[PDB]
């Protein structure tokens, strides 16, 4: 049993962290050749650097899952919410943790996919998604169409996103570490999300004398938060 | 009503507000018709439109060579949509020439003005016209007058260096049966853009072309 | 400003700005004011404090008649949305505002009112691109 | 002319920046040898680093004199407000910037001293100094007596603390560093005052036709401000 400690906060897991990096690259930071053309941010490793543990939700024989968007599911939560507030201009990875707790007569699998860029959709209208629609904060959404992904393509090839799998039988966590994922150097955070972290439940959770229900646990930190500078000097 | 976005704008280098770029695109300079006066006679000058005008009138002195491209259009009237394959007559006649009065007048056979013979149905007419001013660069802006005559103290800010010439096109072709109407387009692309001493910008309506005179708003 | 007239011909900007002030008031005319910078996507201040918790220079314009700010970046473009008719407008990215920290004071014999002006130009650093028409004069309707 | 700037803060003088150092002692840090022994503190060297400057104060002919109690004047002023409402133990100096404004034809002289422990106290009672009588916050006092400085001692013997001379006809400014002032290596902020800045106008503002009113600038900045630790990792 090992612990995955990030600044003043740390998770105790089940030694399965075989951490996948998704598309092979850690987050670094960004380049210096590409910070002379724009604004150049700060490097607030504070508190920023620290799991978020949400609230835990229960997986039920009938879940059609669970989606994440980031960073609007931190948005308003400790030091990286006040960050994301007072800082117009925002650029982070993050690291995803999840956990499951189950005994040895519990059945379920769940995809832990990292969908960048997860265009939200409708079914059966032409009118787009609202905005409470998209930013459900850190409450998170539940799929309506799991089959379809809820945008009109299939889950079964959702497999070549960044993805992990908990199989009750095998294990019980999955831990994706995401880079940025943007077409810019920076980004604004309130009204864009780069990651949607989404748990199907590609198998049923079944059993015959357990609890029909287990908890699931979500845990996000962001990784290599930079901002804009607040307190350049302008003399 | 408006929606307050923004972007990461990401950016460098300098090679485009270069001046050789700034004022060298190929504007349109003129347009007229003539329903077969009879023919396409103007002065050459870059005041003819206020947007040019504005750009040119940035500096003091600027020295460039001509690109001029003429575009020709014929509409027909009252019955087949067949457009007669005419041959144009695009003569520049410089400052010291005399030029045309009519349309078979004696200067279409100077010799000593450039002409071009192009046809409609073919590529529009292109042509390099030099730097020919009498100064080293010509002058935007002039405070003085041509002489001390009566005549040239109503000609302010006019010298007589800083004409361009005369551009004139006909249709060779006599007149056919049908009725047509000629438009004429003339495109201008400075090159070899030199600029001198850069000026506040115009930032009033203008009252006329050879005064800058101003009014209201 | 000539930044601005200039800039008018151009779609996107960036780069680093220069500011300069002047009290044109009388030698023994003194007094304190507060300059301040709010960065892009805050709050202008409202009040002497706000101003002097920002980024700010508290400047004495007895002593010395000029001062210069330098504004770190400005950036904006023109926006066009893809199916939608809205039209798009780029936020603000900051500003520069002035609170009055003591009173003017002034002898007897000199003047009881003064003035202040104020200039602008952009750095080395500045750049612009996709060169367009200014809708400075405008007024054409047909291609005359 | 020359700026004393701090962080994102600068100040235009007058180029009589003679600064004062209280007891020849700069304000360096907790030093390593005494911060074995008690709770390791952090050095925040952020914001709290900049100058504040409080609104203007009026000097009339008839002016008794004001102070203002550190770091109570800053207690509920930004950055440095904010680190003192958060944490429990702090330890800083200070450097208090006192400015005038006055014309050629104006006389009267401020002294600018800075009092450490300065125990107020009341006149004809022997009830002691309620809380409203002491902490002012960025207010500041003023003074009922200043020729016994509302202690019952002598301003004419306050000349052996720091201080500064502000005379109209010679200079305008004053300066005065302040070092650390306490008997304990660390302090708290909330319910304890290390020194208090008064200006007492010992020679009254005078003038014929002038403005009968002056204004006082005073302009203070926190200088090596350290905390209690928020974030030490408890694995």
């Given at each position: 049993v090992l612990q995955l400690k990030l600044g003043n906060s740390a998770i105790v897991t089940?030694?399965?962290?075989n951490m996948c990096c998704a598309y092979g690259?850690?987050?670094?930071?960004?380049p210096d050749n590409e910070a002379t053309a724009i604004d150049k941010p700060t490097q607030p490793e504070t508190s920023t650097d620290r799991f978020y543990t949400l609230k835990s939700v229960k997986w039920e024989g009938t879940s059609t899952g669970w989606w994440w968007k980031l960073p609007d599911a931190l948005n308003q939560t400790g030091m990286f919410g006040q960050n994301v507030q007072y800082h117009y201009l925002y650029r982070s990875g993050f690291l995803c943790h999840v956990q499951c707790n189950a005994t040895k007569f519990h059945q379920g699998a769940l995809l832990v996919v990292a969908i960048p860029e997860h265009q939200l959709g409708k079914y059966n209208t032409g009118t787009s998604a609202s905005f409470d629609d998209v930013m459900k904060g850190k409450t998170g959404g539940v799929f309506t169409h799991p089959y379809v992904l809820d945008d009109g393509t299939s889950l079964a090839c959702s497999l070549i996103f960044p993805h992990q799998w908990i199989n009750l039988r095998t294990n019980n966590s999955a831990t994706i570490m995401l880079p940025w994922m943007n077409c810019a150097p920076m980004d604004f955070a309130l009204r864009h999300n780069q990651w949607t972290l989404a748990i199907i439940p590609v198998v049923p959770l079944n059993t015959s004398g357990g609890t029909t229900m287990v908890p699931i646990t979500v845990s996000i930190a962001p990784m290599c938060c930079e901002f804009n500078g607040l307190r350049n000097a302008i003399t | 009503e408006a929606i307050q976005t923004r972007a990461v704008i990401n950016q460098h280098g300098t090679s485009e507000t270069l001046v050789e770029n700034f004022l060298g695109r190929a504007a349109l300079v003129m347009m007229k018709d003539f329903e077969y006066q009879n023919f396409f006679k103007w002065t050459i000058n870059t005041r003819s439109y206020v947007q040019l005008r504005r750009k040119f009138e940035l500096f003091t002195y600027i020295r460039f060579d001509s690109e001029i491209t003429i575009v020709p259009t014929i509409r027909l009237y009252t019955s087949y949509s067949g457009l007669p394959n005419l041959t144009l007559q695009a003569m520049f006649v410089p400052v010291g020439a005399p030029t045309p009065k009519s349309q078979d007048s004696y200067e279409w056979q100077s010799a000593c003005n450039p002409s071009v013979f192009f046809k409609i149905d073919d590529p529009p007419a292109r042509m390099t016209i030099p730097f020919m001013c009498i100064n080293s660069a010509y002058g935007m802006f002039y405070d003085g007058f041509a002489g001390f005559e009566k005549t040239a103290n109503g000609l302010y800010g006019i010298n007589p260096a800083n004409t361009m010439g005369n551009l004139c096109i006909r249709v060779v072709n006599a007149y056919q049966p049908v009725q047509y109407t000629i438009t004429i387009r003339i495109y201008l692309k400075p090159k070899h853009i030199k600029a001198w001493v850069p000026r506040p910008p115009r930032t009033m309506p203008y009252m006329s072309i050879a005064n800058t005179n101003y009014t209201g708003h | 400003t000539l930044l601005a007239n200039i800039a008018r011909y151009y779609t996107h900007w960036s780069g680093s700005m220069e500011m300069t002030f002047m009290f044109c008031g009388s030698f023994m005319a003194t007094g304190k004011v507060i300059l301040c910078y709010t960065p892009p996507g805050g709050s202008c201040p409202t009040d002497r404090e706000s101003a002097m918790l920002g980024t700010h220079i508290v400047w004495d314009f007895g002593l010395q008649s000029s001062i210069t700010l330098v504004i770190p970046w400005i950036s904006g473009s023109h926006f066009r949305m893809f199916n939608s008719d809205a039209k798009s407008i780029n936020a603000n990215v900051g500003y520069v505002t002035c609170f009055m920290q003591t009173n003017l004071i002034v002898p007897k014999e000199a003047a009881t009112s003064t003035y202040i002006i104020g200039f602008a130009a952009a750095k080395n650093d500045f750049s612009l691109r996709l060169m367009r028409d200014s809708p400075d004069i405008g007024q054409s309707q047909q291609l005359e």
């Open positions: 089940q030694e399965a962290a690259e850690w987050p670094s930071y960004l | - | -």
